[PDB]
Symmetry: C3
Subunit: 412 residues, 3 copies
């Protein structure tokens, strides 16, 4: 009742409109995009014509994807070279502990919400191990292994190599410094390009979401995850940030708002990574030393929203199948949904492809994934926002916990 | 009558032979190549054997293509970082204005010469836009998009990215300088390699042209463009250079002679770019700051000879078809032939592939391109020389017009 | 009798076990690998399951292959920039003379051993020439030409380009130094990663050899080459090193032992190159200036063991065919087996693929290669050890012969 009477003052909206021009434009892009897409929905237009329509949104995807490679490689090489090897292990343990806990908490919340509301696989593990260790760095930049090398950048392989290379340069001293300085100039220069890409974003988001918007049991399921992601995203994660930092978490979420709205549009944790960087480094004022450490790793392994969706959908398909509830086999679901969360790449429709792991483990048929394909796209847009939000709050949490190591490196 | 009596003095030919050793060798390579090719023309030898024969000319192509990538990327990153953002816009406006005017003048001359002597397409625009914004920089270095990613370097995508990256580094100051210095050493080092490639050029040009030389209406057509390119190339463009600089243009053409003779052999504006660089920077003494700005851009968009050929061939196929002459539809030909000129890549047989755009716009059948395929190769060799000559004179024109901006950067 | 009574002292084995922990572990990996492979040999397991089994050995291959590219490119660019152009020709002549002589001596020894114990092709030359001059440097990093561009790094193309680039930077002075320093930091940093890869090697070698171990005339043939490689490897090459340096060669072989045991496991001169570098630079204390000069070149052209195997197998298939012994045609075998040695890439099963050249030249049928395929893998493991051992002793021989040039560069 106190904040309500405070809200009626009609104070400073002209200053807000002037400052938040771009932020409000992308919000308007979502509003206009939903309106346009539903207006143009009666489709006497072929999928070829759908591709033609969504083209302005496609150029935004090419623009964002462009920067992913120089962004990850320069961030981890400089970031890990900036820190002392032992401090990097400390920072790393903070990240890993935060990642596993938040993913374990999301999968438990996900299982509880479905148990209340009733709405080869070995080759996958070897392909993952194969990608952690790329045989060629030039090819790793635009191809991933799939048992033989499918198209699309091997983010994980580059994440791992850049880290080991970063540690090596840190151990080289002065001889190493030249290369650390080379990669620092390349990071800031690609960060300077994401400033340009940001002005195109409202035009892109409008067309990217408008194009995608062009039995009843699958209906209740969509409502389950959406509710589950609001509990984790807007209630679980903020109180975690508040409990650790003692800072207002909803003001932090306001800073990374452009990153969430772009995640909602692209449905890629990797594509929105350059914008998550711009938001945290600037708007939230997070340290570059730790955003370069947390964000490229969080974008591929820290998938809180995917984990919640993996558990929900693994139990949802079992409802139709009338599969028996085993006290020990539900434990395998929480284990494999956390496993698939880490595994699944930060790219669209990667959630559904990793369901093969979680469906096999329990003993459910993998061909049931076909039922969940139709509605997936909308749940993917939301799942991505929670996967990004986790890396953003994760950076804020780690930065706060690692202030001693950061103050030592600020000596000179 | 005064220059004629002056020419009879038999003075300084031994000094000319000693100095112009390489220049005269490549001229002799064309003379020996035409003789050898016609001598070996009776072909009881398969296309496989033709490939075997033309192999010394193939090694020259691999050698020149090799350097294109480090040459474009280092030239635009340093070149645009060297200049103040506002001066880069001034230099840019001079280039764009020169490019569009010369291309508009060539297409008008081309249309006049044919109207006196009577001898999907949307997917193309989207593919071009897609290539201006590459989704992966490593893949952009050896692949282009074609609706899905065909082989062959995306020169345009790299031209655009290098420019935006160059502007970014220029805005970084000292932090940026390291990377600008890194790309400056990489430019001069690859420029040092083109000095070596130049000694192989006479052997390559000989075999490259000899291999290619191994109804009657298509006969008069070939004579139309050849005459049209001599009017534009040796009369239109030199008087433009003279009107702007007041310097003798045929002495400038003498400096870039090795670049034209290599264009005549390869039929690629991109492949002869490292040699156009060596000729302008040295022989013509043009500024590196502006050759790095003009030449990589001119090689892909400034296609004067292609534009003249596009107009000539669009009207030539209509002669056979007896297609009606519309005052407003000839205006669409001048517009789409200028459009295709900009579009068409600086690689062999790219002129004929972009005829699809100009034939569709008017309302002529695209399957008529098959008639023009046989004679094309020879017209392509000449068209390329005019496309290169335009970038060479264009550099000389811009350098002269931008002497104030260049004198400011020479302060220290 | 003097070294025998000296060996009975039971002195310093605890110091040896502590120091040579890793060296003895990889030896134990071979012992355990042979035992495990023969134990698991009864195969009710498919080739798919064989791939699953050999997976720890596959990760070692991806790890070693990863570093090959930054290792070759940084070694030759810095190495050749470090030296004066004339000194590089001197060092080069020492290498080339050593390479051709040792390969000529191995093929002569190989021919003698078989003549005592009786147990298109033009397209190949053009493909080699095409690869010496790559048309694209980014593609050269992960593809080779095959008449059109097959997968797998073009080591030769990068070896050649890095050398020409190294010479260019050396001729640039100070402007060049930045890039030389850039590539020096990148060499030491990738050399710092091979230290990590080395700890995985015993686990990898165990599984790499165990997986591969899972008429009678082809039996005697295998014994011929194995004996021939022991004569060249353990008798011919050491006395050559002793005659040149006057240093004990079997103490040198002890230093590069990890490199030979890894060659025995991988059967790739290129994959074991980062470990041959670590052994020579450290264990044998060879100069970085010359290991960067000798080793990347030796890994592809200096194939002593392959040459001996090429001669042995070219004459062995003629035994079955009862092909006539011509005094002049045996001279063509020694010539083409030396030719194929240089040609054949430092990768597994490359020896048998280049037999096409040596079988055609004499007049034997190329389809006979099928008979030698079954036993090849084991002979390849040994052939590789002799191909590596040659580069290792070659570095030691060149370093010793070039001490004047090295002492001049140590001035400052
Ligand atoms: C596969 O998914 C990953 C990769 C990385 C991480 C952690 C992380 C984050 N966020 C980053 N930036 O660096 C390190 C991490 C460590 O736990 C360990 C830490 C580390 C400390 C000290 C020395 C190291 C040497 C090499 C590599 C990592 C090292 C680096 C977690 C999961
Ligand atoms: C697609 O085909 C092209 C690309 C480039 C150009 C012009 C050109 C030439 N020649 C070069 N080297 O740079 C710039 C040009 C401009 O007009 C604008 C100019 C510019 C000035 C100031 C800031 C900029 C920031 C980013 C990019 C270009 C900028 C750069 C013309 C057509
Ligand atoms: C295709 O297989 C090869 C490539 C290289 C070599 C020799 C070698 C070794 N080992 C290395 N590192 O460099 C040079 C070699 C020369 O003989 C010549 C030497 C050289 C000296 C002076 C100037 C040069 C300029 C460019 C290239 C090589 C040059 C370089 C032999 C065979
Ligand atoms: N598309 C999601 C991952 C998923 O498909 O679950 C993301 O990039 O965050
Ligand atoms: N081959 C020409 C372009 C064309 O095909 O018209 C050039 O590169 O200049
Ligand atoms: N595999 C051998 C070459 C060969 O196949 O003969 C090596 O790399 O040394
Ligand atoms: Ba430091
Ligand atoms: Ba400056
Ligand atoms: Ba020096
Ligand atoms: Na998590
Ligand atoms: Na993520
Ligand atoms: Na993941
Ligand atoms: Na023009
Ligand atoms: Na051009
Ligand atoms: Na063009
Ligand atoms: Na040899
Ligand atoms: Na070798
Ligand atoms: Na070889």
């Amino acid at each position: 009742a106190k904040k309500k009477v405070q809200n009626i003052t009609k104070e400073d909206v002209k200053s807000f409109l002037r400052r938040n021009a771009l932020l409000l434009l992308t919000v308007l892009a979502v509003i206009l995009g939903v309106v346009l897409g539903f207006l143009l929905r009666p489709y006497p237009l072929s999928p070829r014509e759908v591709k033609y329509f969504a083209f302005p949104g496609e150029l935004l995807m090419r623009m964002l994807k462009m920067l992913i490679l120089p962004l990850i490689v320069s961030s981890l090489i400089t970031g890990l070279a900036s820190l002392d090897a032992k401090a990097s292990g400390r920072l790393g343990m903070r990240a890993v502990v935060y990642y596993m806990s938040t993913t374990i908490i999301a999968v438990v919340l996900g299982i509880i919400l479905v148990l209340i509301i009733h709405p080869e696989v070995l080759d996958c593990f070897l392909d993952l191990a194969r990608n952690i260790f790329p045989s060629n760095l030039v090819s790793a930049a635009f191809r991933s292994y799939s048992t033989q090398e499918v198209e699309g950048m091997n983010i994980l392989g580059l994440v791992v190599f850049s880290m080991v290379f970063g540690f090596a340069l840190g151990k080289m001293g002065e001889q190493g410094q030249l290369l650390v300085d080379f990669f620092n100039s390349l990071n800031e220069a690609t960060m300077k390009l994401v400033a340009i890409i940001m002005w195109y974003a409202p035009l892109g988001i409008l067309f990217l979401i408008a194009g995608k918007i062009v039995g009843g049991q699958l209906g209740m399921y969509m409502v389950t995850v959406i509710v589950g992601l609001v509990i984790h995203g807007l209630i679980v994660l903020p109180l975690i940030y508040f409990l650790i930092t003692r800072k207002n978490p909803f003001v932090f979420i306001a800073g990374i708002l452009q990153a969430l709205i772009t995640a909602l549009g692209t449905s890629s944790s990797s594509a929105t990574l350059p914008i998550t960087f711009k938001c945290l480094e600037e708007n939230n004022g997070v340290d570059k030393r730790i955003t370069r450490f947390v964000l490229p790793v969080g974008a591929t392994i820290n998938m809180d929203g995917t984990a919640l969706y993996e558990a929900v959908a693994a139990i949802f398909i079992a409802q139709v199948n009338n599969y028996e509830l085993d006290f020990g086999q539900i434990i395998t679901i929480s284990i494999t949904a956390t496993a698939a969360s880490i595994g699944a790449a930060g790219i669209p429709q990667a959630g559904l492809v990793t369901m093969v792991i979680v469906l096999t483990a329990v003993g459910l048929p993998t061909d049931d994934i076909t039922l969940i394909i139709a509605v997936d796209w909308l749940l993917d847009r939301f799942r991505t926002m929670v996967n990004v939000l986790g890396d953003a709050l994760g950076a804020g949490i780690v930065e706060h916990l690692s202030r001693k190591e950061l103050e030592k490196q600020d000596a000179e």
